[PDB]
Symmetry: D2
Subunit: 114 residues, 4 copies
């Protein structure tokens, strides 16, 4: 199934933050309406917060997270969870190798802000 | 129901990261086996990271997130989500007022690391 | 925080199913736009299905689950989870006593159908 | 990533329930410790409960859900969510065709019981 794709409410600010847990350098791209809106990278085996940014979901509300290592797409897992019918988290994990820890880059999207 | 309390596997490293979205200064305390292990404080209405840390769950695995504003506890909402039977997120939102956006401090715990 | 309240897409069929795990007879009410749309009542300590129904979310999309035992409201916990940006679960647990298992009535709402 | 595989606490009763939403007849197999423990089949486009059973997770705690339609494996999506650190849901959706609704067979596992 497709993973790392989320429909947000239109014209809404959201946070996106990425964490690294890998010997390989992670690159995280965040697309809004199919155009890159943020890119983060780093290399940590201790959960470094390699990047954070505030974005707007725009007219479409379509947000996509992609992760690559050495130019090769990682395998993604994702879900969205909503608490008290108000607080939203879109969650992504990724695997760059064979150990299947799926933490090599972790991406958290949250809304609303403010 | 109790919120913000999570049982992690014992003796496991985990990440904890807090974001703020409120005019009030947020104080996030993270307890491991009922003792304060980390504390983050800050103010933002733009989802700023007010702190991040890596902790060990210890012998009990018991982790609790508390959120307060000027010493008064916020109302918490939380859940744990597990992707591909491996990647864990413990998620907390909090409300310091009446608008019920539950984003005033947002706390993300993730494991495993490395 | 309020629990057991969910905003569904409008005019959408959804499933609602209730399970019981308690010495007490559970009464589950499902409200659509603040009006009772289904009521399930039964008793089991073995996860028996006490009711299942397909309902329409109507013009508002507002769906609320209430649980009581001998007329006393149970304490609720809830969340919504979305898989592959398409498959939705609205999940409710409830506690009628002191053991905090939160399984006394378990309610699963799923959509889309068909 | 692997989907439909869950690690439950050992020697624990759990509920497993399957719903159908497809023109094709669904076959759901539930494995405990790699051995078939339950099997459900049926056709519905109205969320019929094609099976519900209480099983024991045994010494391993390993539970796997497989879904097929006239012998062809469906593509699976899955996640686990835990509410109030007590109430567990393991969720599976499946796609047998081209529309990517992922509801063709829906399987919900819940624990603890009683
Ligand atoms: Ca890895
Ligand atoms: Ca890793
Ligand atoms: Ca607020
Ligand atoms: Ca706020
Ligand atoms: Ca109980
Ligand atoms: Ca019970
Ligand atoms: Ca389908
Ligand atoms: Ca379908």
């Amino acid at each position: 199934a497709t993973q790392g794709v989320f429909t947000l409410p239109a014209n809404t600010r959201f946070g996106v933050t990425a964490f690294a847990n890998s010997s390989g350098t992670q690159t995280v791209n965040v697309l809004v309406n199919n155009e890159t809106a943020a890119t983060f990278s780093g290399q940590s085996t201790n959960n470094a917060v390699i990047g954070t940014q505030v974005l707007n979901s725009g007219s479409s509300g379509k947000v996509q997270v992609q992760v690559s290592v050495n130019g090769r797409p990682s395998d993604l897992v994702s879900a969205q969870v909503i608490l008290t019918n108000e607080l939203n988290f879109a969650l992504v994990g990724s695997e760059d190798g064979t150990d299947n820890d799926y933490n090599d880059a972790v991406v958290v999207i949250n809304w609303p802000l403010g």
